[PDB]
Design a binder for these strands. Sequence first.
DNA 1: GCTTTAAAAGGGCA
DNA 2: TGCCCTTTTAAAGC
Length: 182
Amino acid sequence: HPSGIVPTLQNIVSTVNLDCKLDLKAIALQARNAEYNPKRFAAVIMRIREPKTTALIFASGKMVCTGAKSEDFSKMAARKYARIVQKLGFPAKFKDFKIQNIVGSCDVKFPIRLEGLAYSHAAFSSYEPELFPGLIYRMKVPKIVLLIFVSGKIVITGAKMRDETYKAFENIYPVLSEFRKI
DNA sequence: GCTTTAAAAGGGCA
DNA sequence: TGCCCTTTTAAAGC
């Protein structure tokens, strides 16, 4: 972090394979923290308080865990959901846990000339303020999307490893500085 | 409460 | 096919 700023992780999306068929209607009735409407979505939605997360549990045994603040917390929450399911009578395992997306944010503490930035990086930028206030920066190396705001606040998403989040930010920092709004 | 970004999982449907 | 279905999260401006 040569910039001296470390992006704060805000959301983690992970998946794990409980590796066994699940009866969603049965889980929905037995569990307390569950909501299920197959007419609306194919998953049983369940939430736990710590780590604060929301899981999407499918009949196939696959599961998505969202909302955690770190990879470890995401794994811890997913394991907690796996236990809830096991305790409900299913032979759940914890197969192929994988971090699918990491979302982070930081503040460079200086305003940015978005249009000027967008113009000099047309091949990576999308800036249509009338639709969304942030400039969409699609970085190719690492393959990460940064939402750059006039305030100097930045959102960095698309990473499967936190080093990608940090690297994309370090890569953008000198560009942000070049376009500092005086 | 909406807009925008990323990602995963599945059923529905044109 | 292809893509929305839903869920999470930050941001600024409407």
